[PDB]
Design an enzyme around this catalytic site. Structure first.
Site, PDB file in Angstrom:
ATOM      1  N   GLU A 199       6.709  -5.968   3.003  1.00 54.49           N
ATOM      2  CA  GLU A 199       7.094  -4.566   2.788  1.00 54.49           C
ATOM      3  C   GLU A 199       7.576  -4.080   4.162  1.00 54.49           C
ATOM      4  OE1 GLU A 199       4.877  -0.844   0.561  1.00 54.49           O
ATOM      5  OE2 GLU A 199       3.736  -1.933   2.087  1.00 54.49           O
ATOM      6  N   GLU A 251       7.174   9.677   2.488  1.00 50.66           N
ATOM      7  CA  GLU A 251       5.771   9.564   2.053  1.00 50.66           C
ATOM      8  C   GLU A 251       4.827  10.435   2.885  1.00 50.66           C
ATOM      9  OE1 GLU A 251       4.225   5.249   3.672  1.00 50.66           O
ATOM     10  OE2 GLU A 251       5.857   5.134   2.249  1.00 50.66           O
TER      11      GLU A 251
END
Length: 217
Positions: free
Chosen positions: A111, A199
């Protein structure tokens, strides 16, 4: 067109105009409003213990080939981004995606984050400074254990480029970040997606992405 989370449904994911969209929360609330193409605006209130929120839009690559096989990957964006509450919290605006290692030998599942702006806290580790798009980024990798694009908790790798001078618009040569990580000897799997991601952890805020273009040549 708006998608709301934390009020019955904790997630919505889909596609529009050829670009993905995904909003998710655990314990917070928020929404994403689509614009044309890959554009969107998002807002979150997750300034609570373990409040967690994400909103992202991007280009799926189908996990077809090694991320560094693409000759050129560009991302151009313009946003306003603000954190308005922080219960010992933080947030970031970043390019985001995965390198898929399904079917691949001695390659990790990755990721990755190319972090353009953040508030209060950003990941860090012993790393190296590099010059990309005329700007300084610190690169590093780290282990993480958690849910994955493939299913439940596993131990995988995260790759990071953290921009030293925060900004909320500009050009990113995404393929140059991949090359820099490759230069470190880090394993590079198949490109899953390239997304722009807002986020927030134990925070509240807004990100209004008025320009977002993702392409490969």
């Amino acid at each position: 067109m708006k998608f709301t989370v934390g009020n019955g449904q904790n997630q919505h994911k889909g596609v529009n105009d050829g670009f993905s969209y995904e909003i998710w929360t655990n314990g917070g609330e928020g929404s994403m409003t689509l614009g044309s193409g890959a554009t969107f605006k998002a807002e979150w209130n997750a300034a609570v213990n373990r409040g967690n929120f994400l909103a992202r839009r991007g280009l799926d690559f189908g996990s077809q080939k090694k991320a560094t096989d693409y000759d050129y990957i560009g991302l151009d964006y313009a946003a306003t981004y603000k954190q308005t509450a922080s219960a010992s919290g933080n947030s970031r605006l970043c390019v985001y995606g995965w390198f898929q290692n399904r079917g691949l030998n001695g390659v990790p599942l990755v990721e990755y984050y190319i972090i353009e702006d953040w508030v209060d806290w950003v990941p860090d580790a012993q790393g190296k400074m590099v010059t990309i798009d005329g700007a300084q980024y610190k690169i590093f990798q780290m282990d993480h254990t958690g849910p994955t694009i493939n299913g439940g908790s596993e131990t995988f790798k995260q790759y990071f480029s953290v921009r030293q001078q925060k900004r909320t618009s500009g050009h990113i040569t995404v393929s140059d970040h991949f090359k820099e990580w490759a230069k470190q000897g880090w394993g590079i799997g198949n490109l899953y997606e390239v997304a722009l991601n807002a986020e927030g952890w134990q925070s509240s805020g807004v990100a209004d992405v008025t320009l977002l273009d993702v392409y490969t040549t």
